Design a protein around this ligand. Structure first.
Ligand SMILES: [Ca+2]
Ligand SMILES: [K+]
Length: 275
C-alpha cells in the first residue's frame, strides 16, 4: 500500500491532486547527491553529473538526493510514499559526492546546467557559510531566465541576533525555506534571519532511499523539496505564470506562524497559493 507522508498533507497538496493538478510537464531539477533511478517509486527523466569522480547522476552513493527527490515527486501508485508533485519531470543534477559534500564550482556548473536545459524549478537542499560572485551570478541568471529557485535555509539554528541562513538561500532571488514539525513549531536547527522566506515540514520526513528503501530524515534540506514540489503544482495549474508570480503567490498565502525572523511569511499552503 502507499503511505502519504504527513508533510505532503500538511501543505495541502492532496487537494490539488484530487483536482487533477499533479505537476505534469514541469521540469524540476534536484541539485544534490544524484537520484537512484532504479527506485520503483521514482521516475527520473534525465540530468547530469558535475562531480569528476562520480560520472553517473543516477547512482546515489549518499542517499540524500534520492530522499529529496521522493518528497518532490514519488509516484502516485500502490507502493511507497507520494510526492508533492507526483507527475513532475524529475532531473538528477549530481553536484555532491558520496560523502555529501561538493565544491562550489560543481554546484555552480549544476545551476548553469539547469538554466541551459530549461528547468522550470530548481531545488538546492544544500548551503555553505559563504557566497561568491559566481554563485550569486548563477542564481540571479536563473531567476532572470524565469526559473523558480528554492533552497534550504540551513540547519545552523540561532546565533544571538545574527542571520544564520546559508548560501545560496541568503540571496534575494532565491526562496529560502526553514523547517517546521507536524505541530507547526519551528525545528530547533532551522536557520533564521531576514532572508528566510517560508517554512515547510522538515522533521522526520519519510521518503525514498536507494535500493528500494524508505526512511526518515530531518533538516531544512527536507523542507525545501516541499516548496519546489509546490511550485510545480502551481505551474501545472497556471502554466502562464512567471516565476515572480509563483513566488508571490506562495509567500502571500501562507499560514502565518511567529515572527518572520524565525518563520518567514509562515507555512506554505499550496491550495491557497494555486487559486
Ligand atoms: Ca508511491
Ligand atoms: K532568500
Amino acid at each position: 500500500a502507499q503511505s502519504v507522508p504527513y508533510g505532503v498533507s500538511q501543505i495541502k497538496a492532496p487537494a490539488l491532486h484530487s483536482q487533477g493538478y499533479t505537476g505534469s510537464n514541469v521540469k524540476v531539477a534536484v541539485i544534490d547527491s544524484g537520484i537512484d533511478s532504479s527506485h520503483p517509486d521514482l521516475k527520473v527523466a534525465g540530468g547530469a553529473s558535475m562531480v569528476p569522480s562520480e560520472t553517473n547522476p543516477f547512482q546515489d552513493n549518499n542517499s540524500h538526493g534520492t530522499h529529496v527527490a521522493g518528497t518532490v515527486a514519488a509516484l502516485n501508485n500502490s507502493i511507497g510514499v507520494l510526492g508533492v508533485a507526483p507527475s513532475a519531470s524529475l532531473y538528477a543534477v549530481k553536484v555532491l559526492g558520496a560523502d555529501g559534500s561538493g565544491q562550489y564550482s560543481w554546484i555552480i556548473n549544476g545551476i548553469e546546467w539547469a538554466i541551459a536545459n530549461n528547468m522550470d524549478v530548481i531545488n538546492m537542499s544544500l548551503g555553505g557559510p559563504s557566497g561568491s560572485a559566481a554563485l550569486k551570478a548563477a542564481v540571479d541568471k536563473a531567476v532572470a531566465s524565469g526559473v523558480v529557485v528554492v533552497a534550504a535555509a540551513g540547519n545552523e539554528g540561532t546565533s544571538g541576533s545574527s542571520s544564520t541562513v546559508g548560501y545560496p538561500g541568503k540571496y534575494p532571488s532565491v526562496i529560502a525555506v526553514g523547517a517546521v514539525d507536524s505541530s507547526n513549531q519551528r525545528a530547533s536547527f532551522s536557520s533564521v534571519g531576514p532572508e528566510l522566506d517560508v517554512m515547510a515540514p522538515g522533521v522526520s520526513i519519510q521518503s525514498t532511499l536507494p535500493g528500494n528503501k524508505y526512511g526518515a530524515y530531518s533538516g531544512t534540506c527536507m523542507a525545501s523539496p516541499h516548496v519546489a514540489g509546490a511550485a510545480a503544482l502551481i505551474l501545472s495549474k497556471h502554466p502562464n505564470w512567471t516565476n515572480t508570480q509563483v513566488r508571490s503567490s506562495l509567500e502571500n498565502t501562507t499560514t502565518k506562524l511567529g515572527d518572520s525572523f524565525y518563520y518567514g511569511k509562515g507555512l506554505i499552503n499550496v491550495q491557497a497559493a494555486a487559486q
